[PDB]
Amino acid sequence: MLDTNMKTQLRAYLEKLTKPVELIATLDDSAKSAEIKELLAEIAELSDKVTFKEDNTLPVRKPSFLITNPGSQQGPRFAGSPLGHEFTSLVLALLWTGGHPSKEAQSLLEQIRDIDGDFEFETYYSLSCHNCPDVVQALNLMAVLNPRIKHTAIDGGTFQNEITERNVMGVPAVFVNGKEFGQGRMTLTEIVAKVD
Numbered sequence: 001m002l003d004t005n006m007k008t009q010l011r012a013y014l015e016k017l018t019k020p021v022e023l024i025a026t027l028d029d030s031a032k033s034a035e036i037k038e039l040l041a042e043i044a045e046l047s048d049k050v051t052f053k054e055d056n057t058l059p060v061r062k063p064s065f066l067i068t069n070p071g072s073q074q075g076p077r078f079a080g081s082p083l084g085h086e087f088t089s090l091v092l093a094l095l096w097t098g099g100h101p102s103k104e105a106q107s108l109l110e111q112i113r114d115i116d117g118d119f120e121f122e123t124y125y126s127l128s129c130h131n132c133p134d135v136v137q138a139l140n141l142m143a144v145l146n147p148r149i150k151h152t153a154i155d156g157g158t159f160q161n162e163i164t165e166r167n168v169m170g171v172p173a174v175f176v177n178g179k180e181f182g183q184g185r186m187t188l189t190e191i192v193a194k195v196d
Helices: 004-014 031-044 084-097 106-113 132-145 160-165 188-194
Strands: 021-026 050-054 064-068 077-079 119-125 149-155 173-176 179-183
Touching: 004 084, 021 031, 031 050, 031 064, 064 084, 077 084, 084 132, 084 149, 106 132, 106 188, 119 132, 132 149, 132 188, 179 188
Parallel strands: 021 050, 077 149, 119 149
Antiparallel strands: 021 064, 064 077, 119 173, 173 179
């Protein structure tokens, strides 16, 4: 759950929201999904621009949630716990989806918006990985920027079966359209270059 520090900090960042943001979760009856429900609950009451609904009907990982805008189905998805060192990533995805501008250069955002082709990214991370945030954040931004680019950040501690199943030896481990894309550090620019 959110610790007093995260909550207070989150409350402060959210003041940057200008558009309404929705957190749509897909849960099961497991304890893990209980945590998520509690967390998305706390987050929603830190701001009136944030709503927490749930559609446990979607053919997606459980638990998981989508960060989007009302009336929209676009945005990055977090499967498992978005805390630990990914908390900054959670904050940023909320901010970006809520209208707050990325610090990236305008010409770069544009190149990202003009990317042709459909890419379904999946990134495995651990709550304690220090090099994962930048990768997760780069792919989240791309998903907020281009509806053709999807991204699901997966907490390895909630989907362990997938870690061995895909033989993930380290994190962050990124996949695109089901196939390995790259592991370890990467920049938004290095990533954008691989997908044209």
